[PDB]
Amino acid sequence: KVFGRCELAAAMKRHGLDNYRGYSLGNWVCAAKFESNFNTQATNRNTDGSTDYGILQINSRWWCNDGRTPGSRNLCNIPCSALLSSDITASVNCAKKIVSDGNGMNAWVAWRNRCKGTDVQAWIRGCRL
C-alpha cells in the first residue's frame, strides 16, 4: 500500500502527529517521503542483522521484534510484521515511542538529512487538513 502525499498527511494528522513533541505535520510526511516513499511494505536491510519496516522504516533492533535481529529490545513491543500493514496505526503508534526518546525525529536519518527545519510545510501544501 502506497499512500498519497496528502492522502497520508490526513491519516497522519488524524493520528495527531501534528505539533507532536514540537513536530509539525510536515516533519512527518517529509520523513515518510524520503524513508519509504509512502510505501507500507517497504523493507530495507542493514549490515547489522537488522531490517527497517514499513512507511516510517522502524528498525528491528530496538523497536520491533522480527525474531532474527541481534540485541533486540522490542521497545514498541510488536511483531515488525504489523509495521507492514496498510493501517498505519502500528507505525504511527510506534513512531510516538521513538520520539519520547530524546533525539526526537533526528532518529529518522532521511528526516534529519532532508527536512531539518527547511519548510516541511511544503508537504502539506494544498493538503486540506
Epitope: 542493514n46 549490515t47 510484521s81
Partner: antibody, heavy 116, light 108 residues
Framework: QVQLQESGAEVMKPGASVKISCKAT????????IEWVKQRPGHGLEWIGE????????YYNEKFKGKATFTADTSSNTAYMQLSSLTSEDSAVYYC?????????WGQGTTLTVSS | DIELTQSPATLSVTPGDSVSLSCRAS??????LHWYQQKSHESPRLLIK???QSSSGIPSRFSGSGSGTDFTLSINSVETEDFGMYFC?????????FGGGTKLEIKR
C-alpha cells in the same frame, strides 16, 4: 514443536517450472521470515531469498531475482517457491528454513532433477 | 556478498582427537556467525549460534569462539558420529552466505 514440511522429489524437463512448498506449523507464521537455500552437489549452500508470509514482502539474492518467486498461503500455512525456465543447473536440493539469524528449523529438502 | 572461506576442505581425524575448523569472513560480520553440521542427505543442523552459544542437545564436545573475520568451531574428542560436512553461515547482511564446507572423514 516447530516443523517445516516440504513437497517431494520433482523430475522436470528443461524449460518448464516447478513449485516447491513449505508448510510450517508451531508458530505465528506471519511473524518470522521463511528463507530458501539451495545445495547443488559440488557447491556449498546458496541463499535464494526470503518471504515474510502475508505481508507482500520478499527479497531476492540478485542472482535469483527474476528466476525464483516466493508466495505464501496464510490460510494453509504454506510458503511456496517457483523456479522457472529450468536448466541443468537447477537440479539441486532446496530448503525452507525459518529466519532466526541462525537457521535452527529447516524443512526436509526437496530434490529437483531437470532432464529431457 | 560477504564471502566466508573455510579450511580445510577435508580433514581426516582418528576418533578421540581434537579439531579446529576455521571460518574467515571477507569483512567483519561482527559476532554473527553460526555453524551447522550435515550428515549425508538430511538438512543441516545448528551446532553453534552467534559464534558461541550452545543450542541445547548439542554435545558439549562442540564449542566455538572468535570474532571479527576469524571464527573457529572446535570439536574436542571426535566420535564416529561427528563425521559429515560442517558449514558456517553469516546473518550480518543479505544475501546470507555459507562457507564452502569442511568435510570431516574418519582416519583408519
Amino acid at each position: 514443536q516447530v516443523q517445516l514440511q516440504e513437497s517431494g522429489a520433482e523430475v522436470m524437463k528443461p524449460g518448464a517450472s516447478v513449485k516447491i512448498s513449505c508448510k510450517a506449523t508451531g508458530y505465528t507464521f506471519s511473524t518470522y521470515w521463511i528463507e530458501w537455500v539451495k545445495q547443488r552437489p559440488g557447491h556449498g549452500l546458496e541463499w535464494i531469498g526470503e518471504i515474510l508470509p502475508g505481508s507482500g514482502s520478499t527479497y531476492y539474492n540478485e542472482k535469483f531475482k527474476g528466476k525464483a518467486t516466493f508466495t505464501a498461503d496464510t490460510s494453509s500455512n504454506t510458503a511456496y517457491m517457483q523456479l522457472s525456465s529450468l536448466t541443468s543447473e537447477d537440479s539441486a536440493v532446496y530448503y525452507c528454513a525459518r529466519g532466526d539469524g541462525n537457521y535452527g528449523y529447516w524443512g526436509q529438502g526437496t530434490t529437483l532433477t531437470v532432464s529431457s | 556478498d560477504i564471502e566466508l572461506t573455510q579450511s580445510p576442505a577435508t580433514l581426516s581425524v582418528t576418533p578421540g582427537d581434537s579439531v579446529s575448523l576455521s571460518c574467515r569472513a571477507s569483512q567483519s560480520i561482527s559476532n554473527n556467525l553460526h555453524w551447522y553440521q550435515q550428515k549425508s542427505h538430511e538438512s543441516p543442523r545448528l551446532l553453534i549460534k552467534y559464534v558461541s552459544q550452545s543450542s541445547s542437545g548439542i554435545p558439549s564436545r562442540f564449542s566455538g569462539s572468535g570474532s571479527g573475520t576469524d571464527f573457529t568451531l572446535s570439536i574436542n574428542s571426535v566420535e564416529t558420529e561427528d563425521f559429515g560436512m560442517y558449514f558456517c553461515q553469516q546473518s550480518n547482511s543479505w544475501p546470507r552466505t555459507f562457507g564452502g564446507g569442511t568435510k570431516l572423514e574418519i582416519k583408519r
